[PDB]
Structure 1
Amino acid sequence: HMGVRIENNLFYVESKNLSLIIENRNGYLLLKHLGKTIKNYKGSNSVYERDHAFSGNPTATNRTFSLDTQRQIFGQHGLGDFRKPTIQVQHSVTEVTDFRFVEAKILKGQNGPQGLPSPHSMDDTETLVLMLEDSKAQLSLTLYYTTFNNDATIASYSKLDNNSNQEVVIHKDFSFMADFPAADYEIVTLQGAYAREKTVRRQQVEQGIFSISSNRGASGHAQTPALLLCEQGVTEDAGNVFAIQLMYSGNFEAFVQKNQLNEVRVAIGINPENFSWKLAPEEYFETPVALVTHSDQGLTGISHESQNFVLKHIMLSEFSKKERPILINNWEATYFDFQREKLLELADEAKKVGIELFVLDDGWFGNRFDDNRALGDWVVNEEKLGGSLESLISAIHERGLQFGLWLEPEMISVDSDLYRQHPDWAIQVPGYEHTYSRNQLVLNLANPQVVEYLKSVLDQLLFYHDIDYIKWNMNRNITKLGNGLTYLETQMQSHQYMLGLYELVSYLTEKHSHILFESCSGGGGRNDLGMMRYFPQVWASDNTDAIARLPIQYGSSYLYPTISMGAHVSAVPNHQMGRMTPLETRGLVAMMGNLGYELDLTNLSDEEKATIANQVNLYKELRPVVQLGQQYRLINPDTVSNEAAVQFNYGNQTIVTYVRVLSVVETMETTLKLKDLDEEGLYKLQENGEVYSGAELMYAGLTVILSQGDFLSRQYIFRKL
């Protein structure tokens, strides 16, 4: 049985196979249990209350009760707890608050913070509402924990109300916190860099503080809003994992603190850096939604839990189970140097190889002949497109292709009519020169005039043209914060930018819900669950190298479903890596994701065209297995591995892709075992027609054979009889 229960001084937040059990102790909220379902909880794992040196107390005479030593669900500074705080509010002469629990309510169904991405399909949920108050400060803090009946996830966020007669200022307000008992733990995060997104990092939890964060105004290439706290020795198949994630695309922080007693605090939320929030009397602030997800089936377990939750409750329903079009994108193919004839020729060749969607990338607007001007000027360059965008689109439609278009709405060039008309719309500081990045500036989406302008321009573009797909780019990070009329308004502008962004994209994606929106930020610079609420796929990386893509796809699909993960067959030598890779391998690597093509098909040989046509026919068949099926990692492409292998199951279909990076010699062949088959099932391998029991494939496995050479790959395809 699932939902929320209030029983004496215990609160039970009960998702499928995941419970949070909280105790109200004289107004303080204690974390009793987070993990597998327990009913009729007694307190076997309660904190033993004793006098801990230098851990102080709310009363003079009781030295054994201390907020320094109790496990909690939110953290304050100044009451005796010295662990990192998650709520900190300035009021009058202090930033000490003392919020005490006053009352609990339970909601059913749809619920979430206004103006921020939050779960959908909530009919079968309940929400615990914990109302806290600081009577002296006249502030309310309300905590929300939501259950899901079909996933081992709990969602959380908070609302702070200013009920005083004076302005107060929020300095810290995280979205989730948990104190976990002293034990050995490891943490897994996704970090990396541009052209190396979502690098899987694992390390031991150590005394002190570990954190990942972005202060870039976007979640960023080099850190994802995720942190997995794992049982010592977790594997792909076994051990406990708790994943905490944030539905937010701006500045965030995730941290793990191991304190003097060996206790462990984890939290995720808006980054304190670049953040303050003024609340006038009666104003309130709601934090982005955090998620806590649990598996006892190791890292594959947490992958499945997280992917499932995303598919059912974050990604748009219109697209979450919809096969995505195999596209051609002209960017690597032509860069800025294209015109109508070139486009239609590429379109002709795309149609012959059976590509479904044609995406016109950067350079169709203003005088965008390079990347030094024109952002902000969303006017069609009819000279370059050889007529109206309407006529181009009709040409593409008549060739039997869907039509897609690149935008970069959040940005403005100095050399643009937009900047000439409104220089103050850029994020900037009075009396400081601009800081430049790709020779462009960032629009101040905290400015409601900026949001109104973008709604208007883009609504016009989408209503007047038959566009099937949008690629929404964002190509630099935020510098030079100083657009407020006061310091405090500037401290607010990075979050207000996000609120402006989400108002913009929720509006457009809702008003034009037939269009497939793909998010992008120089590839994976903003690939988070805030964006995935509105954009059901993402350009995972500008790195289109088949081999460099292996660790990238490993990370990009670790917590996020494969269907989200844009991957394109590109030209050789690869433009990022300077590498030759077999076209077969480029195909197989991209087919572990959401397949498209990005190279000049008009300059291919007849053979290369035929190969691509064969790849497209293959993927039309594999697409449901890849995009709708269950993913199992078999060999991980980490920093030391010479191999990658990934399996997908979907009904009677099982496929396995294998890649080897460097050629080897006098080395026994790898034995590759499949997972999650029917032991008694009979599995027919397409290439040799042999029929194997599931037991054989899982417990004996495949001897993997390759010729001599680098970057070779192969695919095994099975049908269950």
Structure 2
Amino acid sequence: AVIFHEKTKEFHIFNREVSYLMRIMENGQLENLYYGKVIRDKEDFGYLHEEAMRSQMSVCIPEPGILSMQYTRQEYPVYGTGDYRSPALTVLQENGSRLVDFSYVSHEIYKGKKGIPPLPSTYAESEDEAETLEVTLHDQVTDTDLVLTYTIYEDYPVITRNARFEQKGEQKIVLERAMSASVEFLDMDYELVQLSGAWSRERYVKNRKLEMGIQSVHSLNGTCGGAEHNPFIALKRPQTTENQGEVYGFSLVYSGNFLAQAEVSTFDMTRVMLGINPEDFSWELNQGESFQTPEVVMVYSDRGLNKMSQAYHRLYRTRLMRVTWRDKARPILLNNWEATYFDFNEEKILKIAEKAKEAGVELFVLDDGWFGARNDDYRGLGDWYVNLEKLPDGIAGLSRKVEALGLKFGLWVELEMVNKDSDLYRAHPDWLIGAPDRFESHARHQHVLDFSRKEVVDYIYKMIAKVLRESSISYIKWDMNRYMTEPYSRGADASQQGKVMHKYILGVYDLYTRLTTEFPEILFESCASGGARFDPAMLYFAPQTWTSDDTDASERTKIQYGTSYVYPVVSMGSHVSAVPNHQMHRMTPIETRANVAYFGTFGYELDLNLLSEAELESVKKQIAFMKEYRELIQVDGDFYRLLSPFEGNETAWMVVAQDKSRAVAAFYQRMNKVNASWIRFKLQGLDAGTLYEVSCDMAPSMVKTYRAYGDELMQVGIPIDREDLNKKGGDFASLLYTLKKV
């Protein structure tokens, strides 16, 4: 509950777990007085905020008082009044100046969380799920108005922050830089945690030690956040493992360019900011206009990384996903991409679907190569009508046939790229992104379409709506395969060019808002050559994402471990692939592929009419196993990480029911060893005092079962023979253990 003490001008933000503290300075600026574990509310916290005299210290109050911003923890810093660190805001007037001074005016208080129109954010279904405060600041040299919002969630240790700007004078301004968050700490004995990777290597967990200077991650891709750095930042004490210790986590809800920075000054202070990347960003507000910035979610944990990740999972799964697909399971599908690629026909698709129906697959998805020419990857992408020479009947015929068989239908789309061999290039050549006399940049022989303008979006919607309505698709895979280059918009004036790379992202949002409204029964999945656009946004639109194009059980273990720090289990896509890998060219048991793909959205990518009888009855059995444990793995249960692919060659996962009545756990190893030490496998998150029946199957490439109390598996753990792992394949073995309360 937010509380205001009038005499001292303090704002207290606190629920049962976290606590915040602010104060009005001698100016109209705010200060940070505390951020962390909850404390008892007491008035006059003013003995905090010490101050003293130092050499060459520039102050910004009248003659007898000295107060420099260099030595105080401000909320929304500026540069030009005495602070020589990095700023967070920058404004240009008509005098050529960049000097601003926002002062406090008033505040508003209420309950529940409101919405920010142009951008997606979390919500609150009831009026008693959150509480919010709004602080307003005014400027007098230029009639600018600034608003800062603070939301606290009840029953969850999360605080949400954003900002807003309004112009109500008669002078135009330029916003060259405007971050979304800024939080400051006194000491520096922290470590920085980030997720860094690349194509088929996304989101590896990396640690750094804080030092004097600046340390940052950023993206300059324009179209997406890219595969290199993921918009998520953590601070953790060096003595904080996954079962205990303190940690702060910051996550940004936005899908384009971003910057996350931590600066440590010489006097040991730390400052962290998250927001848009001010590379080529310059908004150009006039009278009566406005500007809203993406929001940031902050989580504090006092018990290790698992608690913070679980809070992120539950919030993103309940209060961010859409109501329709929030608390429902996910289907088992089959994709024919890797099985046939560009070469296929109607009857081949029917044969594959007929075999898959016998196996038990629930729906069939048709991949690239059903439109335009599509002989190679050089031909028409803007032509979104069915090919007739290669499919004589059309999409409606295939949909009705595969519905008669007993399966559901789905399609693949890439709605924002065009080729030099499409109809739109000859029709409307000047609908691309580029500038005069500038060389075009080709990636996979394709170019990027200009969604800065509504005219192109209407044209794309006209075809997508009419191809979806005259057919029975219930699953759409939206794709993306390019990075943006030469950001120029040929439908804007010379003074509106600093919004292009931003407005493009907006164009990609509202199109979704159309398709998900007209068609509310279609399930969506975002994909960008793997996990290149995988972020807290688009969980508002597409409740699952294709994690990577790797599909290797020896690699997806490491990728999912790194990915599961902030994102829930339900939204991570995963598939079972052919035995000789197209990426590593490795060999892997079917058992371990099934074990790895269980945690996520189960599926298939191979051809089911090409295997052997023993390797097919196992497919049927694992489909049944997923059909049984799907709702425990996905809808009801908390994720726990036990061992890590980093600093080792073993991995271990587990999900437990909320009432501690069921659990499934897994053990994986990467290489093999002889004469090795004994193994004890220690579990987590169970209930001590409950007699659990641990079961496992040890069929080579019989079933063991024994009863043990909750605490014994906690401290002692299950013993694992290294000969059993050598009869389940040596290099990449794995063992799935199931528990029940009886």
Under a length normalisation based on structure 2, what TM-score does the superposition of the two structures give?
A: 0.94
- Residues 1:211 and 2:221 aligned together: no
Matching residue of 1:251: 257
Q: For the Cα contact (< 8 Å) 1:13–1:128, is it kept in 2?
A: no
Give the Å deviation of 1:254: 0.8
Partner residue, 1:558: 565
Determine if the alignment matches structure 1 residue 111 to structure 2 residue 118: no
Alignment CA distance shift 1:67-1:511 (3 Å): farther
Deviation at 1:317, TM superposition (A): 2.4
Q: Name the structure 1 match of 2:601.
A: 594
CA separation in 1, counterparts of 2:273 and 2:350?
A: 51
Partner of residue 3, structure 2: 5
Do the aligned residues in 2 keep the contact of 1:371 with 1:438 (CA within 8 Å)? yes
User: What is the distance in 2 between the residues matched to 1:397 and 1:382?
Assistant: 21
Q: Which residue does the alignment assign to 2:691?
A: 682
Identify the residue that residue 700 of structure 2 maps to in structure 1.
none
Distance 1:62 1:660 in 2: 69
Q: CA deviation at 1:90?
A: 1.3
AA aligned opposite 2:266: Q
Q: Does 1:340 align with 2:346?
A: yes
1:396-407 equivalences in 2 (<5 Å): 396-407=402-413
Distance 2:92 2:362 in 1: 56
Spell out the pairing of 1:367-446 with structure 2 (5 A cutoff): 367-446=373-452
> Could you tell me which residue of structure 2 aligns to residue 715 of structure 1?
736
- Kept after mapping to 2: 8 A contact 1:75/1:83: no
Partner SS, residue 715 of structure 1:
strand
| DSSP-derived class of the 1:548 partner | helix
Is the 2:188–2:264 contact (alpha carbons within 8 Å) kept by the matching residues of 1? Answer: no
* 1:16–1:148 CA contact under 8 A, matched in 2: no
User: Per the alignment, in what secondary structure is the counterpart of residue 203 of structure 2?
Assistant: strand
- 2:111·2:132 contact (CA, 8 Å) conserved in 1? yes
The code of the aligned residue for 2:538 comes to M
CA distance in 2, matches of 1:216, 1:300: 31
Alpha-carbon distance between aligned partners in 2 of 1:90 and 1:690, rounded to the nearest angstrom: 72
Kept in 2: contact 1:517–1:536 (CA 8 A): yes
Q: 2:525, 2:151 → 1: CA distance?
A: 29
Q: Distance in 2 between matches of 1:62 and 1:335?
A: 77
Aligned to 2:633, what secondary structure does the other structure show? helix
Distance 1:54 1:552, change over 3 A: farther
- Residue 710 of structure 1 and its aligned partner are, at CA, apart by 0.7
* Residue equivalent to 1:47: 49
SS at match of 1:68: helix
2:710 to 674, 694, 705: 694
CA contact 1:553–1:593 (8 Å) conserved in 2 = no
| Shift in alpha-carbon separation, 1:338–1:163, aligned structure 2, 3 A | same
| Distance in 2 between residues matched to 1:470 and 1:45, nearest whole Å | 59
> SS of the residue aligned with 1:171?
strand
Distance 2:37 2:513 in 1: 35
Q: Matches of 2:251 and 2:22 in 1, distance apart?
A: 20
AA matched with 2:320 = I
Q: Aligned partners of 2:363 and 2:566: how far apart in 1?
A: 27
Contact 1:23 1:31 (8 Å CA) reproduced: yes
Could you tell me which residue of structure 1 aligns to residue 281 of structure 2?
275
1:239 matched to 2:248: no
Q: Report the Cα offset of residue 133 of structure 1.
A: 1.4
1:421-570 correspondence to structure 2 within 5 Å: 421-484=427-490, 485-570=492-577
Per the TM alignment, residue 477 of structure 1 is displaced from its structure 2 partner at its CA by 1.1
Whether the 8 Å contact between 2:225 and 2:258 is mirrored in structure 1 is yes
SS at match of 1:564: coil
Q: Is the 8 A contact 1:378 1:457 kept in 2?
A: yes
Q: 1:676 is aligned with what amino acid?
A: G
Relative to 1, partners in 2 of residues 1:208 and 1:63: Cα closer, same or farther, differing over 3 Å? farther
Q: Please give the alpha-carbon distance, in whole angstroms, between the structure 1 residues aligned to 2:322 and 2:611.
A: 37
Q: AA paired with 2:3?
A: R
Aligned equivalents of 1:189, 1:549: Cα separation in 2: 18
Inter-partner Cα distance in structure 1 for 2:376 and 2:124: 43
Q: For the residues of structure 1 that align with 2:69 and 2:465, how far apart are their CA atoms?
A: 52
Q: CA deviation at 1:547?
A: 0.7
Matched to 1:681, the amino acid is T
Mapped partners of 1:388, 1:162: distance in 2: 54
Cα deviations by residue, 1:197-223 (Å, 9 ceiling, x for unpaired):
111111211211111111102111111
Following the alignment from structure 2 to structure 1, what is the Cα–Cα distance between the partners of residues 197 and 691?
Answer: 41
Match of 2:159 in 1: 154
Q: Percent identity?
A: 39
Q: Give the stretch that moved more between structures: 470-479 or 49-58.
A: 49-58
CA shift in 2, pair 1:678/1:64, >3 Å: same
Residue identity opposite 1:694 in structure 2: G
Given that 1:323 and 1:623 are in contact with CA atoms closer than 8 Å, whether structure 2 keeps it comes out as: yes
Of 261-270 and 52-61, deviating more is 52-61
Report the count of equivalent residues: 718
How far 1:487 sits from its partner (Å)?
4.6
Q: Distance in 1 between matches of 2:371 and 2:290?
A: 41
2:327 corresponds to? 321
Distance 1:224 1:16, change over 3 A: farther
Deviations 1:430-487 (A, max 9, x none): 2112111111111111111122223322222332222111111111111111115345
Q: Is the 8 A contact 1:545 1:574 kept in 2?
A: yes
Give the letter for the 1:515 counterpart.
I
Question: Within the alignment, does 1:61 sit opposite 2:63 as a pair?
Answer: yes
Say if 2:385 and 2:467, in contact at 8 Å, map to a contact too. Answer: no
Against the structure 1 CA distance between its residues 169 and 618, is the aligned structure 2 distance closer, same or farther, given a 3 Å change threshold? same
Q: Which amino acid aligns with 2:532?
A: G
**Aligned twin of 2:86:** 84
How far apart in 2 are the matches of 1:678 and 1:75? 47
Decide which of 615, 626, 629 is 1:619's aligned counterpart: 626
Structure 1 distance, partners of 2:197, 2:607, is 30
Q: Please give the alpha-carbon distance, in whole angstroms, between the structure 1 residues aligned to 2:180 and 2:388.
A: 48
1:398–1:262 distance in 2 versus 1, CA, 3 Å: same
1:18 aligns with 2:27: no
Structure 1 stretch displaced more, 481-490 or 243-252: 481-490
> 1:277 touches 1:488 (CA, 8 Å); kept in 2?
no
When residues 52 and 606 of structure 1 are mapped into structure 2, their CA distance, relative to the original with a 3 A threshold, is farther
Conserved? CA contact 2:142–2:171, under 8 Å: no
- Whether 1:263 and 2:269 are equivalent positions in the alignment is yes
Q: Quote the residue 2:701 is aligned against.
A: none
Say if 1:169 and 1:718 are closer, same or farther in 2 by CA, change over 3 A: same
C-alpha distance in structure 2 between counterparts of 1:317 and 1:84, whole Å: 41
Find the residue that maps to 2:609 and give its secondary structure.
helix
Does residue 129 (structure 1) correspond to residue 134 (structure 2)? The answer is yes
How far did residue 5 of structure 1 move? 2.6
Unaligned runs of 5+ in 1: none
Deviations 1:338-383 (A, max 9, x none): 2211211111122122111211112222112332222221111233
Match of 2:299 among 293, 300, 304: 293
Aligned to 1:636: 644
Task: Give the TM-score taking structure 1 as reference length.
Answer: 0.97
Matches of 1:317 and 1:513 in 2, distance apart?
11
The answer for the alignment partner of 2:359 in structure 1 is 353
Amino acid at match of 1:236: E
Partner-residue secondary structure (3-state), 1:614: helix
Instruction: Choose the corresponding residue for 1:192, options 197, 200, 206.
Output: 197
Shift of 1:229: 1.3
The amino acid that maps onto 2:666 is T
1:102 partner SS = strand
How many angstroms apart in 2 are the aligned matches of 1:65 and 1:654? Answer: 57
How many angstroms does 1:45 deviate by? 8.3
Matched, 1:38 2:30: no
